[PDB]
Design a protein around this motif. Structure first.
Motif, PDB file in Angstrom:
ATOM      1  N   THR A   1       0.843  -1.140   0.004  1.00  0.00           N
ATOM      2  CA  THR A   1       0.015  -0.125   0.015  1.00  0.00           C
ATOM      3  C   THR A   1       0.865   1.161   0.006  1.00  0.00           C
ATOM      4  OG1 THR A   1      -1.925  -1.069   1.159  1.00  0.00           O
ATOM      5  CG2 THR A   1      -1.800   1.244   1.409  1.00  0.00           C
ATOM      6  N   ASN A   2       1.958   1.211   0.773  1.00  0.00           N
ATOM      7  CA  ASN A   2       2.664   2.534   0.954  1.00  0.00           C
ATOM      8  C   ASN A   2       3.568   2.811  -0.458  1.00  0.00           C
ATOM      9  OD1 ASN A   2       1.656   2.344   3.572  1.00  0.00           O
ATOM     10  ND2 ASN A   2       3.615   1.571   4.446  1.00  0.00           N
ATOM     11  N   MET A   3       4.029   1.582  -0.818  1.00  0.00           N
ATOM     12  CA  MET A   3       4.651   1.776  -2.313  1.00  0.00           C
ATOM     13  C   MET A   3       3.649   2.281  -3.445  1.00  0.00           C
ATOM     14  SD  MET A   3       5.460  -1.326  -4.906  1.00  0.00           S
ATOM     15  CE  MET A   3       3.809  -1.635  -4.722  1.00  0.00           C
TER      16      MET A   3
ATOM     17  N   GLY B   1       8.680  -0.179   1.101  1.00  0.00           N
ATOM     18  CA  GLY B   1       7.226  -0.160   1.708  1.00  0.00           C
ATOM     19  C   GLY B   1       7.132   0.917   2.885  1.00  0.00           C
ATOM     20  N   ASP B   2       7.906   1.810   3.072  1.00  0.00           N
ATOM     21  CA  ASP B   2       7.928   3.015   4.023  1.00  0.00           C
ATOM     22  C   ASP B   2       6.650   3.829   3.525  1.00  0.00           C
ATOM     23  OD1 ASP B   2       9.750   2.162   5.505  1.00  0.00           O
ATOM     24  OD2 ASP B   2      11.317   3.874   5.073  1.00  0.00           O
ATOM     25  N   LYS B   3       5.993   4.255   4.426  1.00  0.00           N
ATOM     26  CA  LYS B   3       4.746   5.361   4.024  1.00  0.00           C
ATOM     27  C   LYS B   3       5.285   6.845   3.872  1.00  0.00           C
ATOM     28  CE  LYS B   3       0.735   5.118   6.489  1.00  0.00           C
ATOM     29  NZ  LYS B   3      -0.519   4.890   5.608  1.00  0.00           N
ATOM     30  N   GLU B   4       4.684   7.360   2.892  1.00  0.00           N
ATOM     31  CA  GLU B   4       4.943   8.803   2.457  1.00  0.00           C
ATOM     32  C   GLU B   4       4.086   9.622   3.169  1.00  0.00           C
ATOM     33  OE1 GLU B   4       3.289  10.759  -0.387  1.00  0.00           O
ATOM     34  OE2 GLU B   4       5.154  12.088  -0.310  1.00  0.00           O
TER      35      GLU B   4
ATOM     36  N   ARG C   1       5.356  -3.142   9.716  1.00  0.00           N
ATOM     37  CA  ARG C   1       4.936  -3.861   8.429  1.00  0.00           C
ATOM     38  C   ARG C   1       5.406  -4.757   8.022  1.00  0.00           C
ATOM     39  NH1 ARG C   1       8.420  -2.490   4.890  1.00  0.00           N
ATOM     40  NH2 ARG C   1       9.911  -0.798   5.344  1.00  0.00           N
ATOM     41  N   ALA C   2       6.585  -5.126   7.407  1.00  0.00           N
ATOM     42  CA  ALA C   2       7.153  -6.109   6.557  1.00  0.00           C
ATOM     43  C   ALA C   2       8.641  -5.838   6.199  1.00  0.00           C
ATOM     44  CB  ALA C   2       6.283  -6.267   5.370  1.00  0.00           C
ATOM     45  N   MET C   3       9.529  -6.769   5.984  1.00  0.00           N
ATOM     46  CA  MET C   3      10.843  -6.399   5.832  1.00  0.00           C
ATOM     47  C   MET C   3      11.215  -6.653   4.362  1.00  0.00           C
ATOM     48  SD  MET C   3      13.985  -7.888   7.893  1.00  0.00           S
ATOM     49  CE  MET C   3      13.017  -6.799   9.203  1.00  0.00           C
TER      50      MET C   3
END
Lengths: 46, 226, 95, 226, 226, 226, 95, 45
Positions: free
Chosen positions: B197-199, B218-221, D84-86
């Motif tokens: 989702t974050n990507m 996958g870090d949130k923006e 979240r996930a690695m």
């Protein structure tokens, strides 16, 4: 505050944030300011 | 993958096959080969063990670990900057840039002469014996069982010892479970759909995640309020 | 008058997922991961059940009330115009 | 799910199978294996028991509980913030952020060195014996019975001891009940369609429910009058 | 449902089955199991008895009644406010809102620590014996009879004691009556289409009927004249 | 319905069946059961007798008549205002409107505590014996005869005592007459199309006919001249 | 003139749900959960009954009265115009 | 027989609808910024 561009999230919903980021806070777009500034700019010229 | 990969030994697949009286001449030796053909043909990256090793490059060449099956990334050790791929046809060859790597056997071929590199790779999980270790997933286990039952019945059909209706049922049932087993291992968990989702939702698109180890992928923006 | 109603079957929502969080991440991503190889779909794939169970698209409970709403609105403009003419007071004469 | 999951022991499925005189050589041992293959292949998250455990991470690694089958979420214990996930390829590896986790076996691999984490997970419900416990749902029970009748008849069809019309009827009837059993467990109750209603109807969209334990997911969104 | 559910004992289905000389080895014991499979697979909410019980929650947990099959709603006893659904992964677990519930076995898991809750649920109607009681509806009774005739003939077809044309007729006739029996119990009466009318025709839409026990759901919406 | 329902006893259907020499082992006892299955499966509301009874509600409960099959309406006795339907999950249950009813067995469950209610319902017409009485309609009589001939031939086809061409003809002929019998009883008379005409043609739409006993439903709408 | 009437079968309204609350949550969400694997639909899937029972879409009781209403409205403008011409009093002369 | 038939395939990505969508959003945001400042595009020329 709304004329100064500050949105209180507690005023438009019951809040179940305090950090200044859009994933949980809301951008305010100042569409009420241009309306008021006509009327004060007319009063300047009356 | 939604479920965790709990490891079990290879003879757990033989309790299931030898319930079938036509598969009673099966061995560990036959279960070893047909497992590795099955593990390869599915290509599930959750069945492999992620390892990281630092090797040193002597002159555009370095010796690769013994258990290596597929490289996730190669990166430099002092910088952390990742290496992409060697498209040069004349790499370490002189006449009279962005760093790269290339791997064929147990040798890696880089663009850097004398450097240490970290290699993040995948291996096979082994036992106390040097033998493969399989997931206890009853979807994986069922379709590995149907894989071996379909390779053994194909031999028996060539011999004339199996009906063509019997092999057609095994070829059909393996064909369904192989897609169910693919979707069981591929379809993300709830915690992997959050990084997906974050990507996916990015107002300023982040297009350089290969330079890191896909760490911030996958870090949130976050966007500031103004 | 309510909107169109989509009739939705959940036979392909993947394993280990709830309908709540699966629909939650489809709001966000506008993508929904599905599973065409669920155990609920072994019939249509193996030829045992009707292949319309893995096909046919989603139905709509759609009532066309908007054509009826527009028809009544157009009749109100007709009757407001006939009343204006019999009184000799036009809409141009009203403004 | 509309109905409640009342638990019954595995031999209740054997009263139903041994009504069929061709399934009279079935055992508890065969009923145990075919249940776990069936429980897995359906993937219904209502058949599992939700558990929460706090484990401590020593250095980017922690030991996972013994009964764990699938993780719902991992979160930090002091904050409550979820992991979240690695996606990193080089995670706990140094050269010369948003926290994450990764699980392969009985080990979890986090992004945090020395921390306690809560893990909300799913396990299998057991008996006084260490044996699986199945729902008493006569839809679940009927299609588990048709599962075992279809695995036993597939062996018997390979042996030549069953008509191809007999197996085709069992393969058809299991195929219908497997979709009816999927829809029986997936299709929400009235009380779960209310939480689905509150998530779906949101004037200011709530897009950060993973950070909580999806706690406020089905909460109703209220708008002030002005 | 248009017709009323008048209750009759289970042996009334056995007068009808034993008119068929191939179904003369049927029992009450076989009629009990095949009824409950049929009652479940149809899922008609008119066959169940609506009950309401107040239970007390000790700490996010309460003990559920013994006859419970499906919960209609759970609500609080002092307020009457209804509970929706537990989407939290970490519910009664502390770190270092709108109330909810969750039910797995004979235990309910709420969001409130020490509170009494009313549970409106469905049970099975029993006899003087502790045995199921079935509707006397000759549509229900006919298709329950065709259900048992189709389960008994499926065994007999596997044995080779029934023609494939005989089973194909029973599978067809049960398939028609099962839809006729579904529509007999689902399609509303005139008095239920009036409550459906009042919910459907609403100038100011009423979108909070779950908070009540859906009490004002079918109430008529009135508009003042001005 | 265009024709009037003149009543005849059940043995008039047995003169017609026993003209067929394969249906000569039929009884009154078999004609009784197959009639009630046929009367139910057609669901024609012209075959039932309309009755009205006043019962008194003690506390949200009242005892329903013995002959009741389907309720037309329930209304209050002092007002005449009709009751719609109970959608409340927590009806007569206190914590710490528009009236309704609900019927399961021989008990009605209302929203009003201590009140007398009129119940307009349908029953079966009986004989001097307590036995069903059927219409003399030769369309009804022919397709009830073809119903019993199709249930008796289905048993005989399972036994192997009837050709599959013979049963296919009976299943076809019952299938035609069942639609002709449905249309014979449903399609209105000239005097019922006049009440349908007055309901359909309404310049000021009358949308509250349930509050009355649908009394003014087919009344003609008159407009004054101006 | 009433609107279009949708003819709706309820064979796929899922188990344990009433038609009232099922239709209630479809007003709100504009989504209706259905069940293509109900026991009422075993005929069309297994090949025993006509596969149009799990298909064909929903019918409409639609009478085209709006073309008739528009035809009468257009004739009223024609007759109001002919009466105007024979009297020598135009619609431009009326305002 | 599709080896002597079927016509030639195209690796066609529809990026031009995406490029036009971004261009139309830039005109929308340049117009909203103009309105909140009270400085029109007619007032800018």
């Amino acid at each position: 505050d709304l004329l100064n561009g500050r949105l209180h999230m507690s005023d438009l919903e019951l809040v179940l944030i305090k950090a200044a980021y859009i994933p949980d806070r809301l951008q305010h777009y100042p569409i009420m300011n241009s309306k008021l500034n006509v009327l004060r700019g007319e009063e300047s010229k009356r | 993958m939604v479920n965790n990969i709990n490891w079990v030994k290879l003879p757990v697949i033989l309790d299931r096959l030898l319930r079938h009286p036509l598969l009673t001449d099966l061995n560990l030796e036959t279960a070893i080969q047909y497992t590795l053909d099955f593990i390869s043909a599915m290509g599930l990256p959750n069945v492999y063990v992620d390892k990281i090793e630092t090797i040193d490059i002597k002159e555009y060449r370095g010796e690769l670990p013994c258990d290596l099956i597929s490289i996730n990334q190669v990166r430099l050790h002092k910088n952390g900057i990742a290496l992409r791929a060697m498209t040069d046809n004349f790499n370490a060859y002189p006449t009279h840039g962005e760093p790269s790597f290339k791997t064929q056997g147990r040798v890696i071929f880089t663009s850097i002469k004398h450097e240490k590199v970290d290699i993040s790779y995948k291996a096979i999980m082994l036992d106390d014996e040097g033998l493969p270790l399989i997931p206890d997933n009853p979807i994986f286990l069922k379709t590995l069982e149907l894989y071996i039952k379909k390779e053994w019945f194909t031999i028996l059909f060539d011999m004339g010892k199996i009906s063509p209706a019997v092999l057609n049922n095994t070829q059909q049932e393996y064909a369904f479970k192989a897609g169910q087993c693919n979707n069981e291992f591929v379809i993300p968990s709830v915690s992997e759909m959050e990084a997906i989702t974050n990507m996916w939702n990015q107002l300023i698109p982040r297009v350089t995640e290969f330079r890191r180890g896909f760490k911030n992928l996958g870090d949130k923006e976050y966007i500031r309020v103004h | 008058n309510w909107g169109s109603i989509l009739e939705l079957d959940l036979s392909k929502v993947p394993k280990g997922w709830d309908v709540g969080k699966w629909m939650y991440y489809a709001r966000v991503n506008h993508i929904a991961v599905i599973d065409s190889f669920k155990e609920g779909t072994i019939g249509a794939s193996t030829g045992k059940l009707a292949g319309a169970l893995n096909n046919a698209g989603k139905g709509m409970i759609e009532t066309n009330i908007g054509n009826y709403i527009q028809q009544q609105i157009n009749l109100l403009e007709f009757i407001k115009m006939e009343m204006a003419d019999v009184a000799g007071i036009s809409k141009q004469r009203e403004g």
